[PDB]
Amino acid sequence: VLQYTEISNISSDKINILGRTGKKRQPLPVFFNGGGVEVVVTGSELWIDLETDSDVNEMWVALEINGAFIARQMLLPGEHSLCLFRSMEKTTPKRVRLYRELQAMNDDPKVKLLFKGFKHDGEFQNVPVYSRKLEFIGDSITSGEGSYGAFDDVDWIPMYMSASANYATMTAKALNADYHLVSQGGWGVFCGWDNDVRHNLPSVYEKVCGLAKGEMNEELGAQEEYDFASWQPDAIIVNLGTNDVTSFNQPEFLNPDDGKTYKMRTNTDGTRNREDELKIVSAIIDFLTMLRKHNPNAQIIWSYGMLGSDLNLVITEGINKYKENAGDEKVSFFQLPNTTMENFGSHMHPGPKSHQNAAKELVDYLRNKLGWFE
Amino acid sequence: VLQYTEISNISSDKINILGRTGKKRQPLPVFFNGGGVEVVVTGSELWIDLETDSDVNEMWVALEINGAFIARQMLLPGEHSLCLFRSMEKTTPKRVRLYRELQAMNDDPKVKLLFKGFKHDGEFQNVPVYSRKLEFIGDSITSGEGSYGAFDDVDWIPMYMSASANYATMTAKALNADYHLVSQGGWGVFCGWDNDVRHNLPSVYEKVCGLAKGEMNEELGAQEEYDFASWQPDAIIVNLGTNDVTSFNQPEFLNPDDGKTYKMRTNTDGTRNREDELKIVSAIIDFLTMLRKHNPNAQIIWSYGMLGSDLNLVITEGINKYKENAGDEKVSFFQLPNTTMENFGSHMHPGPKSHQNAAKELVDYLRNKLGWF
Amino acid sequence: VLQYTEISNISSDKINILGRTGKKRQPLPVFFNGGGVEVVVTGSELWIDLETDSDVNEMWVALEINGAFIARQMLLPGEHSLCLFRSMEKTTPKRVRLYRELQAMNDDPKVKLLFKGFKHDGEFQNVPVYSRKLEFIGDSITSGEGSYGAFDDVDWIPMYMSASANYATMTAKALNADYHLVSQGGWGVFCGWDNDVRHNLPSVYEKVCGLAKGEMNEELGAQEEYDFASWQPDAIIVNLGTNDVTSFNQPEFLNPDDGKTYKMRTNTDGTRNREDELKIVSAIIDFLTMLRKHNPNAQIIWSYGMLGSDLNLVITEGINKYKENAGDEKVSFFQLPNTTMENFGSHMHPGPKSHQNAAKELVDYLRNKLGWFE
Amino acid sequence: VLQYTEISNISSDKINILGRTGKKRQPLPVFFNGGGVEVVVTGSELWIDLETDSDVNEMWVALEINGAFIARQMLLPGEHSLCLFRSMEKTTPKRVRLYRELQAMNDDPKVKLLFKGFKHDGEFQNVPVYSRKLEFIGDSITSGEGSYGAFDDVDWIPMYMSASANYATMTAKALNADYHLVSQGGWGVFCGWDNDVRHNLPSVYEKVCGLAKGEMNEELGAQEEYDFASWQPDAIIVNLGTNDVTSFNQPEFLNPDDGKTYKMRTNTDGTRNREDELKIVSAIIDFLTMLRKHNPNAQIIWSYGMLGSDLNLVITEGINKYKENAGDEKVSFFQLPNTTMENFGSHMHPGPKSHQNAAKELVDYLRNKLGWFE
């Protein structure tokens, strides 16, 4: 006989909730990629009860036991009782981490992941205490898009995305740190790759999950303001700009809302338009002020370069102008290594090896920057 | 809507069946680790209908689309409808490979995996043709035991075993080769690590799946003689001996079947008992004979060393004596690189990196030996 | 027997002179690290006749045959006849490159290396034509200080310096490019590591070899203005800043020239003084102007990071302010990877593996920037 | 002021002599590749006085200070005074290792290296004590032939050979071990690559340096019986067989010393002549006996495979028959990794990387076999 324990009935000491949470606690909505739970349990068997819904973009999850990747799978709409381990030695504790592989989906109001409770024959023990906290904000790189799948695959579908093979989770793991991911493929600091001015991360940063819209998501608490005071990160890693630079080489965008045409322009010369560059610069300044406002003590580190480094000067202009004007001494720039021909995954995006290389250089930087040498 | 096509109703040029098959075609019994199917299909959606049974040791499978690892999961007893992909661009063909992660289980008559058919909106295309064929015979290394899981995990359960992170499948993939895996954790060429003389790979080699025993498996055709003529490998990789050397440092074993006790002995000198070494030599001679008989043209390559190389001399003594007596010029010894501290997986067994290292050296050996440049 | 040919008598197409040269042609003065000659010769034997002088800091050279490192040795004062190869097959050509390992020595008027001629039994053939040209401006990293020697060796001596194991020559080689190295251990863009304001690279850039001073050096043509027009690089790699950062944590410097004390200062909270930061910013602006002036078409790439990246924002402020004012769309910033624990050489400076890692990242960057995919 | 000290006048506790010695101690003959001396000295400078002779094949040496490669150079006939270091901090002890890069030359009676003494302003300190000892017996792989030079270079001359980049010295260094190298390029256990039955390592093993022949070498004591009792290795690594395999595909050899023609035969179906295979087996048994006789306690390890493993079965047949008849439980076979496409040096032989890979695998084997985890 397995006991059933509702997720909200577990002592805060005996569960780590990974990722941003709002007001709803039973069942637990897991809004973000990398989001989920970690428990440490004895016993022979563990199952998690969950509910999922979706249409075009189905849910994916991944499981790690004692820090090691074990499983990865799709979940189709409905109730599931998912077996996390079985036939194990009863007396020894196992650390179990199950998390969402798929990013929040801005244009998809149906997709959701809800954790209800656990079935178990053993007992819950105290979970590791993560004093170190890292927030990651980004585009599809931070969504781990291309981290699975063959070189030539191009379909924009969930199976190619992950938190399981991802520089951010690799960095958090190496540094023994709790982590939040906030990301959206194709989105920029100012506009999306396709010149879509609505597709910027800043506009969506402040709600519990601003990227989860519609009635159903509203019932889950996603559109309420996020309680920043409850989770203050030591550092905020900002990996944005790739899509902003891409937009300069992309056709003009007609906006369905405010019926105007937007285009980040390139000079006849081949260089970027300056006032257009300045729109990014200002967007950067505004975003940095937003971040400082909600995280008064965090080290903000703009970390950019896994898919080219052409926005180097524009990014650092934004930071420098913000810094001098605000007297902010805890804002840095760190360039990530570029993905070489050999290390691409699918969608011509960074694969596992590029993520690993990026995590290695980011971890080294954070050790020195934060004094996290141990 | 979704068409249903039974696995046996896909014409040969539009399916690759991976692994030893017997007389049963519908549904398809998936006997061995690394066994399964590969198809290439258009359409937006593909499902596979399958049945599984198990008790203590539940079934695991892994999915690869266009050669890339996508998913890996447990399957509990019953009929399942597994979605292999969905929401895809309809016109592009996708190569889909779905295989078993769990070895055949000698002492577990209930465990099984059956493939019934596909649900699909697209059409089956010609699959790639693998004229190059490789058979791998081994112990838990070849079962990929330890290829998943943390350093200190020790439970002997399915989640830790794989074909997905495995030197054998990495080797086959690199060389663009069809492969068969025949393996059993803890088993030797002569005896198991615990001195169990019944636990030797030669004794199960000749059947479709000799490691699939009991009534249900018999009905699946596992206990009939394997038709070797239908699938002849270019090379046979034999990775045995690790468990034979281990037995020398392990307590005696009481055989439940004859009441006799068995113990591979070491002298109060620290050295292996010479008479016992010779039982391994004889098992090797006998197994090479068996292998030649069923595979008259294959290059036999004893590949050993991922968990120590202590048996190098006994193995080559076996090979050398067999070869001289048989006049066999197509038998070799290749040493695999040892697993070092930075490269252990779980169970103190080879991890992904060790498998990778071993595959690189083996691939290079096979290119040169077989002219596979 | 062995013919003798003065370096001056070898036709321009039969010799590649590496490094800046002035008016003196016979004998040929080799002013800079990485400086020297490349020839392609048949015959069984080749010797070079040379002259060297020194006292505290003896000369070192290294030999490459067909692009492969062969030899490295010190040369003490006097005339030398150095055997480059012997007992070889007579009919086969070999490419021979002999170059200086030691940087120009600013405060050492005696140290010199002069190439006089070759003793040879075979014939000189046409040497490769390098249309690609790269200038590298740097501190001890670009001097390869630490590229030889054990982890704990600390003596500030020539044997530890090289162009033979050096990210710059590695980059040049990978790219099939002619190269000039101009560097001084301990120097910055504004001041030296010890707060010494006369120890900046801009101040020595414009002469043939501003770092070769005194009478005998003046006779060698070193203090004459360099003819920039005669050697125009496709890209200029600037690796400076490490010593400017260090000066902030270093005791004040008394300048023996003008008797003033100089000190880059740190605020109570540990951050750098803004005004002192601005002095580095200005020096950067001024140097970029100097570079653009003498090199109207070169891509200037500030490449910094092998020993810490804390000057990222200051460097990027300098570049951005310079750029916004001039027309210049041909200045970039590129961050080099940091030297980790297991990749230090001697003097706690980057070792062979660190140079190698840096060269790999820089090469990838240069390919994509300059269109040198082959 | 420079004191002069003869090599034979340094206390045994203040010098490590590397390589086989005979009864000639002053001056010290350096017979073998990897042979030479190690001292540790204070002071600002150190010179070594040495004599060398040669004709076609000139002497090469390499210098390591505190375990780090510093220098490599040719030495032409005559007396030399080599400066090993200078201008150093007087009080710090420096460990200095100077060794021969060139193998003993069987058919070159003129080539020689002698160490006479040191000029030094500091004092000799105690040297490290290497209680662990390793003997390496091999062919050109063990002579490090190909370890320097470009991929397509083919001339059989000294500059391409080394102990400085060599699996044997890499192994010894890793295990903190004294080492002796005994090697001859082209030579086998039974015959040379060209079917020359005189070119076998067993025949020269027992003398101080059996490969140093002729009157001059006789006066150096090379042709006297080696005193094995004075230096007993923990392990003997035998890397032979590559040339024995090769001979099967090479034209017959006309032996000068008798009138006879020798040829290892290949059957008209492509396989090796069994009777000729058995000649190698007998040579192996015979050599193993010889090794056991002079080394009663050593672990003998046949380590083969850096240039193919085709003789795997014949070698282990030799070992197996030897061990059975002798009851010898301290003889092993370890197959070394094959040199792959990316890892060749010059002459289609193993380059630095292949040596390194071989050393790492061999080091791991010896740690386990000899219990050298410390």
CATH number at D372 reads 3.40.50.1110
Whether D57 and D42 have beta carbons less than 8 Å apart is answered as no
The distance in angstroms from the start CA to the end CA of chain B is 45
Nearest in space to A352 (alpha carbons), one of A335, A365, A339, A364: A339
Q: In this structure, what DSSP letter does residue A193 have?
A: T
Amino acid identity of residue B311, one-letter, is: L
Experimental method of this PDB entry:
X-ray
Q: Cβ contacts of residue A187 below 8 Å, gap of 6+? A: A139, A199, A200, A201, A243
Q: How far is A158 from B88, CA to CA, in rounded Å?
A: 11
**Chain C residues in contact with A308 (beta carbon < 8 A):** 368
From CA D143, how far away is CA D156, in angstroms rounded? 12
Interatomic CA distance for residues C126 and B141, integer angstroms: 58
Are D95 and D176 found together in one domain? no
Q: Rounded distance, CA D254 to CA D261, Å?
A: 5
CA nearest C335: which of C255, C237, C226? C237
- Asked whether the beta carbons of residue A334 and residue C319 sit closer than 8 angstroms, the reply is no
B112 and B255 part of one domain: no
Give yes or no: residues D301 and D288 share one domain: yes
- Closest to C263 (Cα-Cα) out of C190, C310, C194, C184: C194
Residue in chain D closest to C66 (alpha carbons) equals D150
Of C73, C85, C155, which has the smallest distance from its Cβ to D71's Cβ? C73
Of D69, D71, D149, the CB nearest to C68: D149
**Nearest residue to A285 via CA among A342, A326, A239, A346:** A326
Cβ-based neighbour number of residue A24 at 10 Å:
16
In the stretch 317-336 of chain B, residues with CB closer than 8 A to chain A read: none
Please name the chains neighbouring B, where neighbouring means 3+ C-beta pairs under 8 angstroms. Answer: A, D
Shortest distance, CA A169 to any CA of chain B (angstroms): 17
Nearest neighbour of D320 by CB, restricted to B316, B361, B364: B316
Statement to judge: residues D182 and D249 lie in one domain: yes
Helix extents (H) in chain D? 167-174, 215-219, 242-246, 274-294, 312-326, 352-370
Instruction: Choose one of B100, B125, B150: the last residue of a domain.
Output: B125
- Position A117: which residue type? G
**Which tokens go with A340?**
């070489």
For residue A146, give its domain range.
126-374
Is the peptide bond preceding residue A27 cis, with omega within 30 degrees of 0?
yes
Using CA atoms, how far apart are residues B111 and B53, in angstroms rounded to an integer?
A: 5
Regarding whether B284 and B234 lie in a shared domain, the answer is yes
CATH number at residue C32: 2.60.120.260
What residues have CB less than 8 Å from D279, skipping those under 6 apart?
D190, D264
- Copy the structure tokens of residue C168: 């710059």
Q: What CA–CA distance (Å, rounded) separates A122 from A44?
A: 7
The experimental resolution of this structure, in angstroms, equals 2.1
Residue B299's Cβ-count burial label (10 Å; 0-12, 13-18, 19+) is middle
Helix, strand, coil percent content, chain D, rounded in steps of 5:
25, 30, 45
Token pair 């696995």 in the structure block, residue? B7
Whether C4 has its CB under 8 Å from any CB of chain D: the answer is no
| Nearest C-alpha neighbor of C171 from the set C128, C135, C131 | C135
Could you say which DSSP state residue A229 is in? G
Question: With an 8 Å Cβ cutoff, is A152 touching chain B?
Answer: yes
Find chain B residues with C-beta within 8 A of D329's C-beta: 269, 271
Please identify which residue in the block is written with the tokens 């960057």.
C365
Residues constituting chain B: 373
Going by their DSSP bridges, the two strands B16-18 and C46-53 should be labelled as unpaired
Rounded (10°) CA dihedral B16, B19, B22, B24:
-60
Q: Which residue has the tokens 């048949």?
A: C42
Token pair for B162:
């794989």
| Domain match, A148 and A65 both | no
Cα distances (angstroms) measured from residue B82 to each of B73, B119, B120, B283: 11, 10, 12, 43
Element (H, E) at A302: strand A299-304
Are C152 and C294 contained in the same domain?
A: yes
212-251 in D: which are within 8 Å (CB) of B? none
Tokens of C100: 């200086």
How far, rounded to the nearest angstrom, does the alpha carbon of residue C110 sit from its chain's CA centroid? Answer: 19
DSSP state of C266: B
Residue B103 · residue B184 · CB < 8 Å: yes
SS3 A338: coil
The distance of Cα C260 from the centroid of its chain, to the nearest Å, equals: 31
Same domain, A15 and A159: no
Judgement on whether residues D103 and D225 belong to the same structural domain of the protein: no
Q: Residues 17-36, chain D: which have Cβ within 8 Å of B?
A: none
Q: How far is CA C63 from CA C101, C306, D148, in A?
A: 10, 26, 12
Among A294, A351, A297, A287, smallest CA distance to A319 is for A287
The token pair that represents A36 in the structure block: 């989920």
Residue among B158, B182, B198 nearest B72 (CA) = B158
The interaxial angle of helices B312-326 and D312-326, nearest 10 deg, is: 110
- Report how far residue A6's alpha carbon sits from residue A25's, in angstroms, rounded to the nearest whole number: 10
Instruction: State which of C81, C96, C125 marks the end of a domain.
Output: C125
Compute the distance between CA of residue C346 and CA of residue C160 in angstroms, rounded to an integer.
7
**Cβ-contact B231, B247 below 8 angstroms:** no
A186 Cα to chain B: minimum distance (Å) = 19
From residue D47, alpha-carbon distances to A179, B231, D5, D53 in Å are 60, 71, 11, 19
Widest Cα–Cα separation across chain A: 73
User: CA nearest B207: which of B222, B185, B189?
Assistant: B222
Residue pointed to by tokens 């003869």: D6
- CA closest to A272 among chain C residues: C329
DSSP calls for C123-140:
-EEPPP----EEEEEEST
- Which of D188, D153, D146 is closest to D167 using CA atoms? D146
Helix D167-174 to helix D352-370 angle (10° resolution) is 40
Contact status, residue C233 vs residue C134, Cβ threshold 8 Å: yes
Q: How far apart are CA B84 and CA B93, in angstroms?
A: 14
Residue A125 near residue A136 (C-beta atoms within 8 A) = no
- Interface contact flag, C72 D76, Cβ < 8 Å: no
Chains B and C share 3 or more Cβ pairs within 8 Å: no
| D111 lies in the same domain as D196 | no
Pick from A269, A309, A316: which is nearest to C334 by CB?
A309
Question: For residue D230, what are its two tokens?
Answer: 């004075």
Q: What is the 3-state secondary structure (H, E, C) of A87-124?
A: CCCCCCCEEEEEEECCCCCCCCCCCEEEEEEEEECCCE
Tell me how long chain A is.
Answer: 374
Q: Find the CB nearest B150 among A67, A87, A153.
A: A67
Q: Which residue in C269, C280, C352, C361 sits closest to C319, CA to CA?
A: C280
The one-character DSSP state at D105 is -
3-state secondary structure string, chain B?
Answer: CCEEEEHHHCCHHHCEEECCCCCCCCCEECCCCCCEEEEEECCCCEEEEEEEECCCCCEEEEEEECCEEEEEEEECCEEEEEEEECCCCCCCCEEEEEEECCCCCCCCCCCEEEEEEEEECCCEECCCCCCCEEEEEECCCCCCCCCCCCCCCCCCCHHHCCCCCCHHHHHHHHCCCEEEEEECCCCECCCCCCCCCCCEHHHHCCECCCCCCCHHHHHCCCCCECCHHHCCCCEEEEECCHHHHHHCCCCCEECCCCCCEECCCECCCCCECHHHHHHHHHHHHHHHHHHHHHCCCCEEEEEECECECCCHHHHHHHHHHHHHHHCCCCEEEEECCCCCHHHECCCCCECHHHHHHHHHHHHHHHHHHHCCC
Instruction: Flag whether residue A356 sits within 8 Å of chain C, measured between CB atoms.
Output: no
- Distance separating alpha carbons of residues D9 and D59, to the nearest angstrom: 25
Identity of the residue numbered A233: P
Hey, is D174 helix, strand or coil? Answer: helix
Task: Specify whether A348 is located in the same domain as A373.
Answer: yes
Q: What are phi and psi of C178, to 5 degrees?
A: -65, 145
Q: Which of A57, A87, A157 sits opposite B88 (nearest CB)?
A: A157
Q: How far is it, in rounded angstroms, from Cα A52 to Cα A35?
A: 14
Tell me if C166 sits within 8 A of C142, measured CB to CB.
yes
Give contacts of D337 with chain B, Cβ < 8 Å: 337, 361
Query: HSE-up of A49 (CA within 13 Å, CB side)?
Result: 14
- Burial class from Cβ neighbours inside 10 Å (0-12, 13-18, 19+) for residue D77 reads middle
Is A284 in CB contact (< 8 Å) with chain C? Answer: no
- Domain end call among D107, D125, D143: D125
Q: Which of D58, D206, D42 lies closest to D125 in space, CA to CA?
A: D42
C313 to chain A: which residues are within 8 Å by CB?
A: 316, 319-320, 323, 332-333
Nearest to A74 among B69, B83, B150 (CB): B83
Residue D69 touches chain C, beta carbons under 8 Å: yes
Q: How far, in Å, CA of A177 to CA of A172, rounded?
A: 5
What is the pairing mode between strands C178-183 and C133-138?
parallel
Residue of A nearest to B67 (CA): A150
Q: Two tokens at B363?
A: 């691939």
Chain D touching partners, 3 or more CB pairs below 8 A: B, C
Name the domain count of chain D: 2
Distance from CA of A308 to the nearest CA of C (A): 9
Residues C87 and C148 both lie in one domain: no
Please tell me the distance from the alpha carbon of residue A208 to that of residue A21, in angstroms, as a whole number: 7
